[PDB]
Write a protein that binds this ligand. Structure first.
Ligand SMILES: [Mn+2]
Length: 210
């Protein structure tokens, strides 16, 4: 059981790459732009399917958006286009650092978390999104958990298989085992203050549409 835990953690790590890519000032500029998105949403300036409001987390879908296992892509033009600042301040930096190739990203999602916010065990929908999955963290430091049985069976299994620190300005790249063979989630105790994340992905050619 102890050997199994270590081997699974090793397998998860094989699909994780992480680098400190954005400086303090660069984060500050991007954070200002994230605040602008929140403000624009409150002004009713985005399309219906661009904005998903939930108690401790808002999701903002750009480029492509979607609706367990039966997720569907919204018809073309239903969500707002990827903001120019996302190209200029985020995607450009990633391309220049060879994290992903030019033209890969067609989906940018911003998750904005309140303190005590979380996400329940899930796999990024395999029928919707190509791999790798790239995420960049902003307002504060947190942790991303892998192997989330503990959210449902706390007496039988208390902890995740692996907890990955996700610092402000850090870029996390998920592939292989970490993207496909294990669930991930965020524990509410790990979000002590506002945290945002920009998730950059490519939708699959045959991602099923509504
Ligand atoms: Mn996810």
């Amino acid at each position: 059981q102890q050997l199994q835990k270590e081997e699974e953690a090793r397998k998860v790590k094989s699909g994780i790459r992480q680098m400190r890519l954005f400086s303090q000032d660069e984060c500050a500029k991007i954070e200002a732009r994230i605040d602008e998105v929140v403000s624009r949403a409150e002004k009713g300036l985005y399309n219906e399917h661009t904005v998903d409001r939930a108690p401790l987390r808002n999701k903002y879908f750009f480029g492509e958006g979607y609706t367990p296992g039966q997720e569907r892509l919204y018809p073309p033009g239903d969500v707002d286009e990827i903001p120019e600042w996302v190209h200029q301040l985020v995607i450009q930096k990633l391309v220049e650092h060879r994290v992903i190739p030019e033209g890969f990203v067609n989906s940018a999602v911003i998750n904005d978390y309140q303190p005590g916010g979380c996400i329940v065990s899930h796999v990024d929908p395999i029928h919707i999104f190509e791999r790798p999955i790239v995420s960049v963290s902003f307002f504060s430091d947190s942790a991303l958990c892998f192997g989330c049985k503990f959210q449902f069976k706390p007496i039988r299994v208390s902890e995740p298989v692996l907890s990955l620190p996700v610092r402000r300005g850090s870029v996390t790249v998920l592939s292989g085992y970490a993207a496909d063979e294990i669930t991930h989630c965020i524990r509410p105790q790990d979000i002590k203050e506002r945290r945002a994340v920009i998730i950059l992905r490519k939708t699959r050619l045959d991602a099923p549409r509504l």
